[PDB]
Amino acid sequence: MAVIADPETAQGFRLAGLEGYGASSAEEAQSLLETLVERGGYALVAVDEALLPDPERAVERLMRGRDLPVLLPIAGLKEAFQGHDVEGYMRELVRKTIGFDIKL
Amino acid sequence: VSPTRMNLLQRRGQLRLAQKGVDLLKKKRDALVAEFFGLVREAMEARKALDQ
Amino acid sequence: LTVAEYLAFEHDYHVLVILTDMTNYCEALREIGAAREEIPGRRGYPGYMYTDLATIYERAGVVEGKKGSVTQIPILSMPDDDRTHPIPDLTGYITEGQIQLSRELHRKGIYPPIDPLP
């Protein structure tokens, strides 16, 4: 398994055992993600929310041929310390899944 | 289909089967939504646990 | 069929008989049937049409002690590709089988378009 995030937490994940990579822009993160995808092996990739809000949009055609790989968005270093409310993610996901967007 | 009484009865049977299938599929969809509305809550809880 | 039977059973020939369209024969029969106010069948055809067709089809076959034979290959057109029309129904109730052509196989370029299931 691997992760693309800020360089400080990337080496922490490498200490934890994940092939972490440091990045600060969307283009390099997407290019390295699609570099990791093409080869068979680990199917789990974690990306910070500051690099790729929609991980499926980058490999949308490779995902159409195989839905097996798992891509998980995650909070960054600065995002974690400032914090947020996770209800917006649910509010977006319900629109993504059933379209009616409404969830009280 | 040639017009006969037997064909008319067969077509009406097909219509009844289609209506029953629709009524069953609606119940299946309701059960799926009932499971979905709890799975989304579990995902919401896990998401905020992962934050801490 | 008189000529065919004579040739088969008097000079030992092997005869093959082809009838182009029995639908026209049924229409010509229906004209006289409707002119004489006979009781109709299922679609205006006369009620004795089964007997009239039986006197035509049943003249083929082989005869014990003779070497001749008569074989019949009638050709008829189902009007709306319909197998339940009176003419194909009364024909299939008399003859010893049928070969049914398929339009779906014809539209795909397949020749001959013989449908094996019916």
Coordinates of C-alpha atoms in Angstrom, one line a residue:
Chain A
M1 CA 0.0 0.0 0.0
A2 CA 1.1 3.6 -0.7
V3 CA 0.1 7.2 0.1
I4 CA 0.6 10.6 -1.5
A5 CA 0.6 13.5 1.0
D6 CA 2.8 16.2 2.5
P7 CA 6.5 15.1 2.7
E8 CA 6.6 15.3 6.6
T9 CA 3.7 12.8 7.0
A10 CA 4.8 10.8 4.0
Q11 CA 8.0 9.6 5.7
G12 CA 5.9 9.0 8.8
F13 CA 3.7 6.6 6.8
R14 CA 7.0 5.1 5.4
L15 CA 7.9 4.5 9.1
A16 CA 4.4 2.9 9.4
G17 CA 5.1 0.8 6.3
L18 CA 3.4 2.5 3.4
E19 CA 5.4 3.6 0.3
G20 CA 4.7 7.3 0.9
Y21 CA 5.5 10.2 -1.4
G22 CA 5.6 13.9 -0.8
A23 CA 3.7 16.3 -3.0
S24 CA 2.2 19.8 -2.9
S25 CA 0.5 20.1 -6.3
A26 CA -2.3 18.2 -8.0
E27 CA -0.5 17.4 -11.3
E28 CA 2.5 15.6 -9.8
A29 CA 0.2 13.6 -7.4
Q30 CA -2.1 12.6 -10.3
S31 CA 0.9 11.6 -12.4
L32 CA 2.5 9.5 -9.7
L33 CA -0.9 7.9 -8.9
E34 CA -1.4 6.9 -12.5
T35 CA 2.2 5.7 -12.5
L36 CA 1.4 3.4 -9.6
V37 CA -1.9 2.2 -11.0
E38 CA -0.6 0.7 -14.2
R39 CA 1.4 -2.1 -12.5
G40 CA -0.2 -5.1 -10.7
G41 CA 0.3 -5.2 -7.0
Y42 CA -1.1 -3.1 -4.2
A43 CA -4.6 -1.8 -5.0
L44 CA -4.9 0.7 -2.1
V45 CA -3.9 4.3 -2.6
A46 CA -4.5 7.2 -0.1
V47 CA -4.4 10.8 -1.2
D48 CA -4.7 14.0 0.8
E49 CA -7.7 16.3 0.3
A50 CA -5.5 19.1 -0.9
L51 CA -4.1 17.1 -3.9
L52 CA -7.1 15.2 -5.4
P53 CA -10.6 15.7 -4.2
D54 CA -11.9 13.1 -6.7
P55 CA -9.6 10.1 -7.0
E56 CA -11.9 8.3 -9.4
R57 CA -11.8 11.2 -11.9
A58 CA -8.1 10.7 -12.6
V59 CA -8.3 7.0 -13.4
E60 CA -12.0 7.0 -14.6
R61 CA -11.2 5.0 -17.7
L62 CA -8.9 2.5 -16.0
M63 CA -11.6 2.1 -13.3
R64 CA -14.1 1.3 -16.0
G65 CA -12.0 -1.7 -17.1
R66 CA -11.5 -2.8 -13.5
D67 CA -13.2 -1.6 -10.3
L68 CA -10.8 -3.6 -8.0
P69 CA -8.3 -0.8 -7.0
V70 CA -9.2 1.2 -3.9
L71 CA -8.6 5.0 -3.7
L72 CA -9.4 6.8 -0.4
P73 CA -9.4 10.5 0.2
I74 CA -7.9 11.6 3.5
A75 CA -7.1 14.7 5.5
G76 CA -3.8 16.6 5.3
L77 CA -1.5 17.8 8.0
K78 CA -2.7 21.4 8.0
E79 CA -6.3 20.2 7.4
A80 CA -6.2 18.0 10.5
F81 CA -4.9 20.7 12.8
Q82 CA -7.4 23.3 11.6
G83 CA -10.2 20.7 11.6
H84 CA -13.6 20.6 9.9
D85 CA -17.0 19.0 10.0
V86 CA -17.4 15.7 8.2
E87 CA -21.1 16.3 7.4
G88 CA -20.3 18.0 4.1
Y89 CA -18.6 14.8 2.8
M90 CA -21.8 12.9 3.6
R91 CA -23.9 15.6 2.0
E92 CA -21.8 15.3 -1.2
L93 CA -21.7 11.5 -1.1
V94 CA -25.5 11.1 -0.9
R95 CA -25.9 13.3 -4.0
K96 CA -23.2 11.2 -5.7
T97 CA -25.1 8.0 -4.8
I98 CA -28.8 8.6 -5.1
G99 CA -28.9 12.1 -6.6
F100 CA -31.7 13.6 -4.5
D101 CA -28.9 15.3 -2.4
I102 CA -31.3 15.6 0.6
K103 CA -30.2 14.2 4.0
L104 CA -31.5 15.7 7.2
Chain B
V1 CA -49.2 -12.7 -32.5
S2 CA -52.3 -14.1 -34.2
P3 CA -55.6 -12.9 -32.6
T4 CA -57.2 -15.7 -30.7
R5 CA -58.9 -16.1 -27.3
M6 CA -56.1 -18.2 -26.0
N7 CA -53.5 -15.6 -26.9
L8 CA -55.7 -13.0 -25.2
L9 CA -55.6 -15.0 -22.0
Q10 CA -51.9 -15.5 -22.3
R11 CA -51.3 -11.7 -22.7
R12 CA -53.4 -10.9 -19.7
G13 CA -51.4 -13.5 -17.7
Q14 CA -48.2 -11.7 -18.8
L15 CA -49.7 -8.4 -17.7
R16 CA -50.5 -9.8 -14.3
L17 CA -47.0 -11.2 -13.9
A18 CA -45.4 -7.9 -14.9
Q19 CA -47.5 -6.0 -12.3
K20 CA -46.5 -8.5 -9.6
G21 CA -42.9 -8.2 -10.6
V22 CA -43.1 -4.4 -10.3
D23 CA -44.7 -4.7 -6.9
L24 CA -41.9 -7.0 -5.7
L25 CA -39.1 -4.9 -7.1
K26 CA -40.4 -1.9 -5.2
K27 CA -40.1 -3.8 -1.9
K28 CA -36.6 -4.9 -2.8
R29 CA -35.6 -1.2 -3.4
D30 CA -37.2 -0.2 -0.1
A31 CA -35.1 -2.8 1.7
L32 CA -31.9 -1.7 0.0
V33 CA -32.6 2.0 1.0
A34 CA -33.3 0.9 4.5
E35 CA -29.8 -0.8 4.7
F36 CA -28.2 2.2 3.0
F37 CA -29.4 4.7 5.6
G38 CA -27.6 2.8 8.3
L39 CA -24.5 2.1 6.3
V40 CA -24.1 5.8 5.7
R41 CA -24.3 6.5 9.4
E42 CA -21.6 3.9 10.1
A43 CA -19.4 5.5 7.4
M44 CA -20.0 9.0 9.0
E45 CA -18.9 7.8 12.4
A46 CA -15.8 6.1 11.1
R47 CA -14.9 9.2 9.1
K48 CA -14.8 11.4 12.2
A49 CA -13.0 8.7 14.3
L50 CA -10.2 8.7 11.6
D51 CA -9.9 12.5 12.0
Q52 CA -8.9 12.2 15.7
Chain C
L1 CA -51.9 -35.7 -60.3
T2 CA -53.8 -37.9 -62.8
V3 CA -50.8 -37.7 -65.1
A4 CA -48.4 -38.3 -62.3
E5 CA -50.3 -41.3 -61.0
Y6 CA -50.6 -42.8 -64.5
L7 CA -46.9 -42.4 -65.1
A8 CA -45.9 -43.8 -61.7
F9 CA -48.2 -46.8 -61.5
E10 CA -48.4 -47.8 -65.2
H11 CA -44.8 -47.3 -66.5
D12 CA -42.8 -47.5 -63.2
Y13 CA -41.5 -43.9 -63.3
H14 CA -40.3 -42.0 -60.3
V15 CA -42.4 -38.8 -60.3
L16 CA -41.8 -35.5 -58.4
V17 CA -44.7 -33.1 -58.3
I18 CA -44.4 -29.4 -57.6
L19 CA -47.4 -27.2 -56.9
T20 CA -46.6 -23.5 -57.0
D21 CA -49.2 -21.9 -54.8
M22 CA -52.0 -23.5 -53.0
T23 CA -53.1 -20.1 -51.7
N24 CA -54.5 -19.3 -55.1
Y25 CA -56.3 -22.6 -55.2
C26 CA -57.9 -21.9 -51.8
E27 CA -58.9 -18.4 -53.1
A28 CA -60.5 -19.9 -56.2
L29 CA -62.3 -22.4 -53.9
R30 CA -63.5 -19.6 -51.7
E31 CA -65.0 -17.7 -54.6
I32 CA -67.3 -20.6 -55.5
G33 CA -68.0 -21.3 -51.9
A34 CA -69.1 -17.7 -51.2
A35 CA -71.1 -17.7 -54.5
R36 CA -73.1 -20.7 -53.3
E37 CA -73.8 -19.4 -49.8
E38 CA -72.0 -22.2 -48.0
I39 CA -71.4 -22.2 -44.3
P40 CA -67.9 -20.6 -43.8
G41 CA -65.0 -21.9 -41.8
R42 CA -62.9 -19.7 -39.6
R43 CA -62.1 -16.9 -42.0
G44 CA -64.7 -17.1 -44.8
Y45 CA -63.3 -20.3 -46.4
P46 CA -65.9 -23.0 -47.0
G47 CA -66.4 -25.7 -44.4
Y48 CA -65.5 -28.5 -46.8
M49 CA -62.0 -27.2 -47.5
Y50 CA -60.4 -29.9 -45.5
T51 CA -62.0 -32.6 -47.6
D52 CA -61.1 -30.8 -50.9
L53 CA -57.5 -30.5 -50.0
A54 CA -57.4 -34.1 -48.8
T55 CA -58.4 -35.4 -52.3
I56 CA -55.3 -33.6 -53.7
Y57 CA -52.6 -34.4 -51.1
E58 CA -53.5 -38.0 -50.5
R59 CA -52.8 -39.1 -54.0
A60 CA -49.0 -39.6 -53.4
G61 CA -47.2 -42.6 -51.9
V62 CA -45.9 -46.0 -53.0
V63 CA -47.9 -49.1 -53.9
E64 CA -47.2 -52.7 -52.8
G65 CA -46.0 -54.8 -55.8
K66 CA -45.1 -51.8 -58.0
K67 CA -41.8 -49.9 -58.5
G68 CA -43.2 -46.4 -59.2
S69 CA -43.5 -43.6 -56.7
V70 CA -45.1 -40.2 -56.3
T71 CA -43.5 -37.4 -54.3
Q72 CA -45.2 -34.0 -53.7
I73 CA -43.5 -30.7 -52.8
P74 CA -46.4 -28.1 -52.5
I75 CA -45.4 -24.5 -52.0
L76 CA -47.7 -22.1 -50.1
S77 CA -47.4 -18.6 -48.6
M78 CA -48.5 -17.9 -45.1
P79 CA -50.2 -14.5 -45.5
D80 CA -49.0 -12.5 -42.5
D81 CA -46.2 -15.0 -41.8
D82 CA -48.9 -16.7 -39.7
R83 CA -48.9 -20.4 -38.9
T84 CA -52.4 -20.4 -37.5
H85 CA -54.1 -19.2 -40.7
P86 CA -56.6 -21.8 -42.0
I87 CA -54.7 -22.7 -45.2
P88 CA -51.3 -23.7 -43.4
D89 CA -53.3 -25.3 -40.5
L90 CA -55.4 -27.5 -42.8
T91 CA -52.3 -28.3 -44.9
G92 CA -50.2 -29.3 -41.9
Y93 CA -53.1 -31.5 -40.6
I94 CA -52.9 -33.5 -43.8
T95 CA -49.3 -33.6 -45.0
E96 CA -46.4 -35.6 -43.5
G97 CA -44.4 -32.6 -42.2
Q98 CA -43.3 -29.2 -43.4
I99 CA -40.3 -27.0 -44.2
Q100 CA -40.7 -23.5 -42.8
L101 CA -38.7 -20.5 -44.0
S102 CA -37.7 -17.7 -41.6
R103 CA -37.6 -14.0 -42.5
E104 CA -35.2 -13.2 -39.6
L105 CA -32.6 -15.6 -41.1
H106 CA -33.3 -14.0 -44.5
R107 CA -32.5 -10.5 -43.3
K108 CA -29.1 -11.7 -42.1
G109 CA -28.1 -12.9 -45.6
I110 CA -28.4 -16.6 -44.8
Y111 CA -29.4 -18.8 -47.7
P112 CA -31.4 -21.1 -47.6
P113 CA -33.3 -19.5 -44.7
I114 CA -34.7 -22.8 -43.3
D115 CA -35.8 -22.5 -39.7
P116 CA -35.2 -25.9 -38.1
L117 CA -37.4 -25.5 -35.0
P118 CA -40.8 -25.3 -36.7

